[PDB]
Design a protein around this ligand. Structure first.
Ligand SMILES: Nc1ncnc2c1ncn2[C@@H]1O[C@H](COP(=O)(O)OP(=O)(O)OP(=O)(O)O)[C@@H](O)[C@H]1O
Ligand SMILES: Nc1ncnc2c1ncn2[C@@H]1O[C@H](COP(=O)(O)OP(=O)(O)OP(=O)(O)O)[C@@H](O)[C@H]1O
Ligand SMILES: Nc1ncnc2c1ncn2[C@@H]1O[C@H](COP(=O)(O)OP(=O)(O)O)[C@@H](O)[C@H]1O
Ligand SMILES: Nc1ncnc2c1ncn2[C@@H]1O[C@H](COP(=O)(O)OP(=O)(O)O)[C@@H](O)[C@H]1O
Ligand code: MOO
Ligand SMILES: [Mg+2]
Ligand SMILES: [Mg+2]
Ligand SMILES: [Mg+2]
Ligand SMILES: [Mg+2]
Lengths: 268, 272, 268, 272, 55
């Protein structure tokens, strides 16, 4: 219709009004960091493995940032599962567990950042909008903690006290917010399988799947947090993600160049 | 025209390295800042046991709130051992591992404080503890903080394991405040001559009372930081610290009343 | 000379002693960022206009930073006037209103910085000492919020609870403190008139005026906060300002090159 | 297609510089925020005298805690003069020296608060004072803060010495809060016609009472900031400020009860 | 008179520690009128007047 229509609705109607919502959906779409890529370094899947997994990926990151702008988010891992176990056993709500897991992702960001410090890559309380380091060809990358900032305001799962939005959703929503061109999950399997490949050996590799097809399979377990699939379908900028095996050298570099090497999960 | 611009003071021009020149001004024993304070250090391994250990301790602490002005400090526990295993695998220095381990002590503090929130107890941060503990203990009966000291990348070198851990940070705070005491809440009855859970447990003999100096001369494992014994030698106020079993209800309550229910560690402060 | 007498006076006298004040005035004058320029992007005059005014100026800023070191301060605008209206209706003092207005200038700095993030320009909490972005030719600019930090310590006006030091004074005092070479106010009029040109038809344009000449006119409204005139007369480094029309393409660019395109207000 | 997007409000579209247009909305005298508050400013030069002056003042403040709700603000003192000497030697502008001098006022506040910690008093930061003074004065009877205002690099130019110092910041807070009073604790009896410790001390005559306007017309040194007189002219609530000798025990206690024991400074506030 | 005084006292509570003591007033004058008519001594009228201060 017009902006004059949107501005009158914005001042006269509730934000829940469908006409206001439809008018706001017609607004322009600005991408803040369109040339950047957000990658998640796995917590339990990578960083918890130690030197044998982190050191090769550190070398790959330093080489890849010559050609790609990187927002490097960290998972949490086994220490968060221990914290979740202690707090769950006490009946603490999901909002309390969320802040406990945030500390573990903070630790992993500190450890990964110290390995990248001599290459100029910093740990940021910003990342997106941390415009200087990304701007510089000598840096071109930052490390951030992958947990969302919901803290006590975390939306709980339908059942249980485990926070449903953790480091997968934290990195993905940052990629979506800043309009990044790609979201890569770096874990310890070739991609999504029909079942957990560590506990089911009849699991088959899934090269590409949609969110609807993925939900129709009724998977018991996943390489990604299930609520991320709904965030993916709701996304405006990042309409697909890739999950790659960080234990195989070159997988991250090839995925950054746009090559399909692991599992691609598409919103549509 | 290149002279030092001094401010006139009793220590002016001094390097502070000449102990004979600094003594007339600073060689005194300090005053007590919070003489009515009681500091309780909760072991991280006690928190690691979960609700089976935390719930009875929470009930004991709840009953202690009307009796004492409590600063409750939590240790790290098994999670700090894992960040040590990952960090040491990555080759990270000791000043890198110190804040990583401290984070687990802080998380234990948030867990314990949440269980006591209905009593008005909250986790408070190190800058708040360092500068605003008095006003917070005027608002509520107790607060929870991390027992680890904020040494961070300025942790002392020598060992690849951070030396200034939860016991040491708690004692540094309690002694700097001039608190009425520090009680260490352990998962064992106290200090033995050997690890009561280790290979030589059959030879472990309980020590009802000991000196920090005799413990420092000893070699072998202890349930407290070895740096705790070093800061006990330079202690200014606290004369004894008791290590009690937090898995036995009532021992923390007894130790806060001066009753001998664990291992008493005599510091370097000579009583009158 | 004699710093010895200055140092003696500093120790034996009150800071109010005229002899001490005179000795301090003879001290050397160091300019922290002599090659930098502080510009204010208007709040009500520019940012409140939205895309039609902000997007062209973003392009000018990105082009201008190749030749000019920029500290980009933001105004507040209509949202601050609403906050001032609510708080004044409750009888809240200027110190309380000052904090409310700072939030609005903060919002505008966030919106402007997000449009500049992909160009490496960050939003800063310490602009004229954020030395690393201003030093790099790849960045050469920072965005900051133009409200002064006075908060509850805001000096009140002679009458009323409106804070007399707002985003004009916040931007100017930054330029003065850091010894910047220039201070440009980017708003929505060609410059200073004898009255508000939006509401007075026979208002005449003033291309150049001194503070003493301006005070002699006793204008009842101005394109700049009136106390800024006194700060300008007291200034040690920034002895003149220019007010330019940011709605005219190229005005900011020409003003950065030293051209007289709007109104120049000089301390003397 | 370039119009300003306005929020409808009584001040919309306005520049806020036209007094006729702002007066109907904001022209009235503000309410008091903390009318029961007593603000006490301790001079930095008083703290500089050490225990001989601080210990009696701490004892007097201790006995005032059950009588008044106190915001205690400390000045900078001689250490700020040294950072001025070094800073001016380096050529630094007045907006650089302002936060450097304020740091010494903060340190004096930490020193004074530590002496009162056993009474529940702690140092509080400027954002805490500005936003959260009410809750902290509900938790405890008094808090300590820095008297310097957070003007920083936005300090006014003109003088190479920061004009908005401890007296000015303390009065700005006291009047903004609408406090019951501001008492300035000096190392002299009050205001004299000359510096009683300077070269013209033989000509100095004590002024038991004066107005801020008369002092502002004067030339020569004063024991209070000259900017204090300027902010007194625009004061909204505080009608008088008394400067008393903190080296004489009991004068602060008397001044807080309205007794004339020093120099009374009348502000510009209209007393009906 | 009482309502404005109560409001003023209310706003004084956060400022001072107050011991508020009330006088007797006109009702003590009446018990004096009756007591003196009955010839009661001064030690009899003192607690009678004090009762009105307590009320
Ligand atoms: N000489 C000793 N006496 C008693 N216990 C010992 C001794 N040496 C080793 N230990 C062992 O140390 C254990 C306590 O471990 P530790 O002190 O590291 O935990 P914690 O104090 O709860 O943790 P944190 O220091 O993080 O708070 C006991 O269970 C015991 O088995
Ligand atoms: N007209 C005057 N009347 C009284 N004292 C004066 C006058 N002029 C100068 N002084 C001097 O100022 C001194 C007080 O110094 P000053 O006010 O700088 O210290 P302060 O207020 O404690 O410090 P700060 O302002 O940092 O809190 C007095 O000791 C006195 O010698
Ligand atoms: N259907 C599935 N396909 C692939 N991997 C799966 C599946 N279900 C579970 N997983 C497991 O999920 C792990 C990655 O998730 P997680 O353990 O949370 O690590 P991270 O800390 O990186 O999130 C992989 O190691 C994989 O074994
Ligand atoms: N004498 C004057 N000359 C020029 N502009 C004036 C004058 N008096 C008022 N104004 C108005 O002041 C506005 C700029 O001030 P303001 O609305 O506060 O903008 P900002 O938020 O950028 O400070 C201009 O839009 C102009 O209409
Ligand atoms: O919108 Mo302001 O607060 O007058 O600069
Ligand atoms: Mg030295
Ligand atoms: Mg232990
Ligand atoms: Mg304006
Ligand atoms: Mg003074």
């Amino acid at each position: 219709n017009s902006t004059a229509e949107l501005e009158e609705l914005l001042m006269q109607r509730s934000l829940t009004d469908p006409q206001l919502q439809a008018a706001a959906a017609a607004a322009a779409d600005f991408r803040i960091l369109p040339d950047a890529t957000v990658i998640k370094i796995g917590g339990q899947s990578v960083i918890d493995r130690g030197r044998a997994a982190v050191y090769p990926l550190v070398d790959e990151i330093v080489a890849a940032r010559k050609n790609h702008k990187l927002l490097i988010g960290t998972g949490a891992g086994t220490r968060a599962r221990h914290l979740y176990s202690i707090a769950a056993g006490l009946g603490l709500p999901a909002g309390v567990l969320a802040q406990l897991g945030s500390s573990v992702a903070d630790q992993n960001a500190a450890m990964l950042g110290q390995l990248l410090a001599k290459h100029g890559i910093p740990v940021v309380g910003g990342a997106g909008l941390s415009a200087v380091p990304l701007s510089l060809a000598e840096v071109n990358a930052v490390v951030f903690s992958g947990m969302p900032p919901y803290k006590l305001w975390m939306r709980p799962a339908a059942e249980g006290v485990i926070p449903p939005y953790r480091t997968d959703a934290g990195c993905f929503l940052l990629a979506e917010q800043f309009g990044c061109k790609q979201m890569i999950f770096v874990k310890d399997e070739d991609g999504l399988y029909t079942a957990n490949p560590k506990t089911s050996k009849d699991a088959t590799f899934i090269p590409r799947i949609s969110v609807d097809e993925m939900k129709a399979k009724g998977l018991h377990d996943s390489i990604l947090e299930f609520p991320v699939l709904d965030l993916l379908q709701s996304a405006q900028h990042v309409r697909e993600v890739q999950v790659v095996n960080g234990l195989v050298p070159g997988n991250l570099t090839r995925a950054l160049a746009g090559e399909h090497v692991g599992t691609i999960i598409t919103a549509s | 025209t290149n002279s030092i611009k001094h401010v006139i003071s009793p220590l002016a021009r001094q390097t502070l390295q000449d102990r004979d020149l600094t003594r007339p001004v600073a060689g005194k024993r300090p005053i007590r800042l919070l003489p009515w304070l009681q500091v309780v250090k909760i072991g991280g391994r006690v928190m690691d046991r979960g609700a089976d250990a935390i719930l009875p301790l929470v009930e004991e602490l709840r009953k202690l709130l009307p009796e004492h002005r409590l600063l409750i400090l939590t240790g790290a526990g098994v999670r700090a051992r894992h960040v040590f295993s990952v960090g040491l695998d990555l080759g990270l220095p000791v000043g890198s591992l110190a804040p990583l381990a401290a984070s687990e002590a802080g998380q234990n503090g948030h867990i314990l404080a949440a269980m006591l929130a209905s009593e008005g107890v909250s986790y408070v941060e190190h800058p708040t503890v360092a500068d605003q503990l008095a006003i917070h203990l005027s608002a509520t009966r107790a607060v929870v903080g991390s027992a680890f000291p904020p040494y961070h990348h300025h942790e002392f070198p020598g060992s690849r394991i951070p030396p200034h851990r939860a016991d040491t940070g708690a004692f540094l705070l309690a002694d700097a405040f001039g608190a009425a005491g520090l009680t260490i809440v352990e998962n064992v009855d106290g200090i033995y001559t050997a690890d009561p859970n280790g290979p030589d447990r059959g030879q472990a003999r309980f020590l009802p009372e000991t000196s920090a100096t005799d413990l420092a001369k000893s070699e072998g494992p202890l349930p407290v930081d070895r740096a705790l014994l070093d800061v006990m030698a330079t202690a200014r106020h606290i004369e004894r610290v008791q290590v009690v079993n937090g898995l036995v209800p009532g021992r923390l309550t007894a130790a806060l009343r001066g009753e001998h229910v664990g291992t008493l560690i005599r510091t370097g402060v000579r009583p009158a």
